[PDB]
Amino acid sequence: YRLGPLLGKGGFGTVFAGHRLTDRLQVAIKVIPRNRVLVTCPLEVALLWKVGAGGGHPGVIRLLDWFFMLVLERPLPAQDLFDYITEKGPLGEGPSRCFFGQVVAAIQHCHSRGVVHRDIKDENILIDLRRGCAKLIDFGSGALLHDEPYTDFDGTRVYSPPEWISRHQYHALPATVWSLGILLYDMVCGDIPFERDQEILEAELHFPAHVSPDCCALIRRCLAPKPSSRPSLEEILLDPWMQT
């Protein structure tokens, strides 16, 4: 492999653009420190291999190799939703619907593999601009799905679910749905719903004028304070806004 220009830096490590020497394929090399992250390969590798077995969702980026330096696939041209929205603004409900079902099926697959992404947000959805195809990146904070709940959260406060704020505990699915909730809101609205803890635990949603009733309805379904109240992946797919 040949590394190239930087793409982004941060707590997720450092992702460089690069290429595979033999076939000149465009790849991304994510560099992770040993004691500043979290056989005996990193969890992230373990997870991506389970996810990448057979073939991805295929809205999940695939790990090509690991050395810590993880060589993953890199669509060209690419851009993440966060930056997408920042340049274009809210997506429209047509497009949003489009990406959103993509994203849910991506996740759906991971769950079948037994992986939970645990940090679904605009930054961690990669848009292949040529194929208009959203792809789930960064399993740095993800973990193995199980019955037992999780007592650790790497996400930002504003993205956290009310049961994390409330009890420092959350189950995979209902937390995932929340995140999708936030995600959907982000796309259609052009920014996240909640800032302060009062609002998250209250689920105080004030929609702008253009969000279709049918849309709003699903967001509110997903941003239910009670975890039980929240829909499941399958049901989100049936939801009236998601059709057509």
Author numbering: 32 to 69, 78 to 106, 112 to 288
From the paper:
The serine/threonine kinase PIM2 is highly expressed in human leukemia and lymphomas and has been shown to positively regulate survival and proliferation of tumor cells. The presence of a proline residue in the PIM hinge sequence (ERPXPX) removes the typical +3 hydrogen bond donor of the hinge backbone resulting in considerably high Km values for ATP.
Here, we describe the crystal structure of human PIM2 bound to one of these inhibitors, the (R)-enantiomer of compound 1. Overall, PIM2 shows the typical bilobal kinase architecture with a constitutively active closed conformation. At the N-terminus residues Gly22 to Glu31 which are disordered in molecule A form a short helix in molecule B while the loop preceding the αC helix is disordered in molecule B (Asn66 to Val78), but partially ordered in molecule A. In addition, the tip of the adjacent β4-β5-loop is not defined in either molecule. In PIM2 both the Asp196 and Asp198 side chains form salt bridge interactions with Arg162 from the catalytic HRD motif, although this side chain was disordered in molecule A. The activation segment is also stabilized by hydrogen bonds formed between Tyr194 and the main chain of Leu188 (as well as His190 in molecule A) and between Asp192 and the side chain of His190. The most significant difference between PIM1 and PIM2 is the absence of the C-terminal αJ helix in PIM2. The structure of PIM2 in complex with the (R)-enantiomer of compound 1 shows the perfect fit of the inhibitor to the ATP pocket. As designed the metal centre does not form any direct interactions with the kinase domain but plays a structural role organizing the organic ligands in the three-dimensional space. As expected, the maleimide of compound 1 establishes one hydrogen bond between the imide NH and the backbone carbonyl oxygen of Glu117. A key feature of both the PIM1 and PIM2 complexes is the close contact of the CO ligand with the glycine rich loop (the distance in PIM2 between the Gly39 carbon alpha and the CO group is just 3.1 Å) in which Gly39 together with Val46 and Phe43 in PIM2 form a small hydrophobic pocket for the CO ligand.
